[PDB]
Design a protein around this ligand. Sequence first.
Ligand code: RNN
Ligand code: GLU
Ligand code: GLU
Ligand code: ZN
Ligand code: ZN
Ligand code: ZN
Lengths: 259, 258
Amino acid sequence: NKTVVVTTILESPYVMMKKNHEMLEGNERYEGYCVDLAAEIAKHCGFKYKLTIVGDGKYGARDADTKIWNGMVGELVYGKADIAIAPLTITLVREEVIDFSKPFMSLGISIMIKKGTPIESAEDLSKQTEIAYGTLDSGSTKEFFRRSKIAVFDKMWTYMRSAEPSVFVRTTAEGVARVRKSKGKYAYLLESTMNEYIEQRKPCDTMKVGGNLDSKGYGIATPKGSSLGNAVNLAVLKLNEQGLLDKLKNKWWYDKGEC
Amino acid sequence: KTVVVTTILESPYVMMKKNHEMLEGNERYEGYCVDLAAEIAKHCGFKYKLTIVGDGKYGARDADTKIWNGMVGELVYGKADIAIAPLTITLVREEVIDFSKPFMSLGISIMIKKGTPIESAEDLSKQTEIAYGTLDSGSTKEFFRRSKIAVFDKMWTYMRSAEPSVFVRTTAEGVARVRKSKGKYAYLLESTMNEYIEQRKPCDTMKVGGNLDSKGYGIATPKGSSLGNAVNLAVLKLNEQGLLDKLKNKWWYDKGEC
Ligand SMILES: CC(C)S(=O)(=O)NCCc1ccc(CCNS(=O)(=O)C(C)C)cc1
Ligand SMILES: N[C@@H](CCC(=O)O)C(=O)O
Ligand SMILES: N[C@@H](CCC(=O)O)C(=O)O
Ligand SMILES: [Zn+2]
Ligand SMILES: [Zn+2]
Ligand SMILES: [Zn+2]
């Protein structure tokens, strides 16, 4: 048995630095939903592990030119990590190079506005020019728009791909900050999970509006044909059935809500 | 080789067409899972035959003989090649068959006759005037059997001992029992089926409260099936094209009559 290298990402409330992290070591430096989940998955599958934050701070995309995978997906593909336990979206292009468990959390793409912004829907955003809108610059949300053949979303993509200055952001935090500082003139397209979390954080000035644009999930990912895939999947099923995943969601989203 | 698909008559997933008696083979049926089977078959490049599960059950394991019934049994014993049905992904099933990523989300929910003074599972568990039960041989019954959550444990104790029986052989039977019991029977069933019935004449039932859990239906194949991989990728593709969302609207709400 060797220590399992876990790749993950600093994304609230999934993985965060503990206030006193400088005084702590190894796994104890972090907290959050995915930190709690990693401990349970390791316990139920019988392995020791080490949490590592993804070097480039990215989720995972393949460069169209170089064909190289970046982010957490890259760490799995190139053998730098053994498992990714993070809000990593299950997608077809990813499933072709890595394996995912059954989804441990559901989510869909959603709209974040600064409160009072006169927008209620994706259709609203597409039919106007006063309010800019964008996505995380690398990730499944961007690809959803890039690939969509649905009229409303294709229209949004045509706008976003050509908008100047860029409407895309490097991190979720950057997108949230941009909504907060843009006096209602920027809306952010991000996953419902992160949207709902931020909605419950001070200064309580953002809101999720409209229905979700799609319906998907986060999965625990392992390299193709990993020895861990089967047991990890069974552990996700057990934890779902025992209500732990619901308990953890409540713990990190709503029990700690500031609004 | 023509792929034998096991499925179950459960609205709006698989239903006999109005004019079924004059039709043959797959053409006799319509519904969400009929459309899904056609899509999966197209994207995986196979011919197939839809067959309705012989015993009318989803699938559970006999505690004594360890024999599986239902669609799960058909896969386990080699009577069918794939199940395309509202079949809930569960740990005990994943141990004997393979599931695709979930093509639809659902949770256990409460169906009441309109006007029944019940708003939650907790409400049901606190009283005795209104009886309540679940489908037999399915994942909802097992949920209550295995739950340690106090409210659900309390409900199970009541349900397992209730006389006359509160359990039903089919969803349709549960729905009929709610409709005819003058508000004195509430039915525990998956949110998907509950929300469908809520939009059907005579428009006398309602879903109340939040869902009791969060899970999904998956396409199932026998362990080590050569079809498992391709079918999973097909589900991902259909999801990403918005086709699953299209089919959900087509069968739930475009056909809504309330
Ligand atoms: C048995 C449970 C562990 S579960 O496996 O039911 N998970 C519960 C959460 C959940 C259920 C259904 C869906 C629907 C979308 N499916 S998806 O794979 O995200 C898409 C990429 C095809 C998403 C997330
Ligand atoms: N969960 C996404 C990142 C966030 C987003 O794209 O909105 C992914 O795995 O790429
Ligand atoms: N979908 C369930 C059947 C219906 C129910 O138990 O509510 C199963 O696969 O067992
Ligand atoms: Zn545990
Ligand atoms: Zn198709
Ligand atoms: Zn028996």
